[PDB]
Amino acid sequence: MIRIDATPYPYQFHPRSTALVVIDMQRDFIEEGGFGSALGNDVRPLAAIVPTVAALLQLAREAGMLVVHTRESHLPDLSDCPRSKRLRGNPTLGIGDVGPMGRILVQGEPGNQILPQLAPVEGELVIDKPGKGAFYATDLHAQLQERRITHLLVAGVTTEVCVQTSMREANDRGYECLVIEDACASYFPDFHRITLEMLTAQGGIVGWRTPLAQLQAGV
Amino acid sequence: MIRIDATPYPYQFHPRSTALVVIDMQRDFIEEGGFGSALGNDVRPLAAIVPTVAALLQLAREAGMLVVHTRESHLPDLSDCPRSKRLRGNPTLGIGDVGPMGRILVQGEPGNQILPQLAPVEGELVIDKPGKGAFYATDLHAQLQERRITHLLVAGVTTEVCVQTSMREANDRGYECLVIEDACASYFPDFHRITLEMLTAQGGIVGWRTPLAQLQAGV
């Protein structure tokens, strides 16, 4: 039983019944000249968390905890990609179009791959999700129930989209979720900040948040 | 084909493939002397939208659109209520305890009921949901697919919790969602405003938003 100083009150977990979930740490969103930059976004806040996510992964692997990685991705034939999502915003470079690191949001492309320095090792779960929420159209809920997981440590990008959605999904499904605040990032500083406040608002309506240092202190 | 002025760009729908979703307009959350007020939340901003929500309901009923209502609710034995949800916030009066309008978040209690001013009528879907998201553990998705619904008009409370969760779920599932901005409300005005900005961010990443007057204009 490990007790972590957290907002809005201390967070308790057992490593055996806890998993680390690292959401969408994908080359196209984070690397200089990748698709993120092209759309005009500041990738720097995302690159700046890479060392903290790496230390979270090493903490989980040392503790022998389950590790889940997610990738936002579609089948190369775009058959799991809703028409709504493909048309949304009439993008010049849309899902499946050739971007700087290959076909945008497509399974097996270089830009779709998880950063090498945070990449999955053998024994870790890897979920390809067609939506922002890690639980929609995936077997993530079933896989965690098979492993008797009750508690999630959450990290990744972006805070107000995939992280928030996945965390809201997990909260509804009965998981106790701790987002590691310095291991999440957004293209929008204000969205990052208000999302973290929303998640722990009203006595922890979605869950808990703490910096890496409080997690390391607990273990 | 009705065309509505909206952010981030005009929203087009056909009434035969469009449903109004009115989320959690329940007595304990909105009435003076309800559990919401007892907890020290100021319910006046939720009460303030009831006439706008009733106008939106009357608009959808006159256009013959499908109308879906949601209630956050649990079986009296709380067998569909995760233990996490019951312990969260170490509450003084928690789920299933007796509040000013009956057992908190329990089906059939006066507090659990949708406001008479927004009551469902015959031929409307009424969804009881054990979470914040209208799609989790409901047949909502299957009911909308069965009736060939592709577009949702979205209203209710609270903006940053059940409205935002339900809209993010609906986006992932391939629905085109227009949140009717003055027909949603939050205990926290800044969470209300910034939720609307996140939902339409990045050229419409979750969906569209517009005031009721713009929807009234298109019909």
Residue numbers in the entry:
A (entry chain A), B (entry chain G): 1 to 219
What does the paper say about this structure?
Biuret hydrolase (BiuH) hydrolyzes biuret to allophanate and is part of the Isochorismatase-like hydrolase (IHL) protein family within the cysteine hydrolase superfamily. TrtA is a member of the isochorismatase-like hydrolase (IHL) protein family, similarly to BiuH, and has a catalytic efficiency (kcat/KM) of 6 x 105 M−1s−1, a KM for triuret of 20 μM, and exquisite substrate specificity. TrtA and BiuH are members of the IHL protein family that possess the catalytic triad comprised of a cysteine, aspartate, and lysine residue. Interestingly, the active sites of TrtA and BiuH are almost identical in sequence, and so it was hypothesized that triuret is the substrate for TrtA, funneling into biuret metabolism.
The triuret hydrolase (trtA) gene (NCBI accession number PKOI01000001.1) tested in this study comes from Herbaspirillum sp. BH-1, which was isolated from a biuret-fertilized potato field. To remove a possible intrinsically disordered region, a C-terminal deletion was made for crystallographic purposes. TrtA elutes as a dimer by size-exclusion chromatography, and the monomer adopts a fold typical of the IHL protein family with six parallel β-strands alternating with six α-helices (Rossmann-like) in addition to a two-strand antiparallel β-sheet at the N-terminus. Helices α6 and α7 provide most of the interactions between the two subunits in the dimer while α4 also has some contact at this interface. The α2 helix shows the highest mobility as illustrated by high B-factor values in the apo crystal and undergoes a significant conformational change (∼4.5 Å) when triuret or biuret is bound in the active site. The catalytic triad that has been previously defined in the cysteine hydrolase superfamily is present in TrtA. It is represented by residues D24, K129, and C162. Also present in TrtA is a cis-peptide bond in the active site between residues V157 and T158, which is signature of the IHL protein family. In the apo WT structure, beta-mercaptoethanol (BME) was found covalently attached to the catalytic cysteine of every subunit. The other chains in the biuret cocrystal that do not have biuret bound, as well as the apo WT crystal, are in the open conformation.
